[PDB]
């Protein structure tokens, strides 16, 4: 995640193993139950896309759901690209590039790039955009997996 250091700057720090394991354990115990979404939300505080793929990729089991989510993440990403067209002409030397759906999904962007966008002024909340897609896709799952 990207956290504030004592000095008063935003720097990246790694997520903790008993945080990781707590994510694992939630999924083990409460599967598709709604409490998973606030839980997720708390444990995703200050998290990167990269950390969010890590969390999704580290799941075991419920592979039908994991595939449905993936496909929702790509749909929501396809929709990001649709709604926000690429911008006019070449990229400025003085500036950094606008993200695509795949940069938001973490796929085409690097960590330093993910830190550029979030730490820069104005900052862009690529975590929160992926977060809604995850929560939206979580609703899809919850609604389906209701019996």
């Amino acid at each position: 995640p990207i956290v504030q250091n004592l000095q008063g700057q935003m720097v990246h720090q790694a997520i903790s193993p008993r945080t990781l394991n707590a994510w694992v354990k939630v999924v083990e115990e409460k599967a598709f139950s709604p409490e998973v979404i606030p839980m997720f939300s708390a444990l995703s505080e200050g998290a990167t896309p990269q950390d969010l793929n890590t969390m999704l990729n580290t799941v075991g089991g419920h592979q039908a759901a994991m595939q449905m989510l993936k496909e929702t993440i790509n749909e929501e990403a396809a929709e990001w690209d649709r709604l926000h067209p690429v911008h006019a002409g070449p990229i400025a030397p003085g500036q950094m590039r606008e993200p695509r759906g795949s940069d938001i999904a973490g796929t085409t962007s690097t960590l330093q790039e993910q830190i550029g966008w979030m730490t820069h002024n104005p900052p862009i909340p690529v975590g929160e955009i992926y977060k809604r897609w995850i929560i939206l896709g979580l609703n899809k799952i919850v609604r389906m997996y209701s019996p």
Binding site: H62, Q63, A64, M66, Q67, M68, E71, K140, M144
Partner: protein, 74 residues
Amino acid sequence: TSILDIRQGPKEPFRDYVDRFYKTLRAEQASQEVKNWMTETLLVQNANPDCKTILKALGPGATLEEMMTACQGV
């Protein structure tokens, strides 16, 4: 176990089968296009006659929530 060996039982819910499929698909490392081909093809083909019948009625263009709710009583 190979992906071709993944098949739906005569009494096995589709759901339990679809889980097995994307677990084994999860251990296949092939190009995405090939894995798309496997998805639309092999899944239905090794599905049981009763659900297979059901899935033929959904037509093409169908998505996983609709397949999964379609073969629920079977």
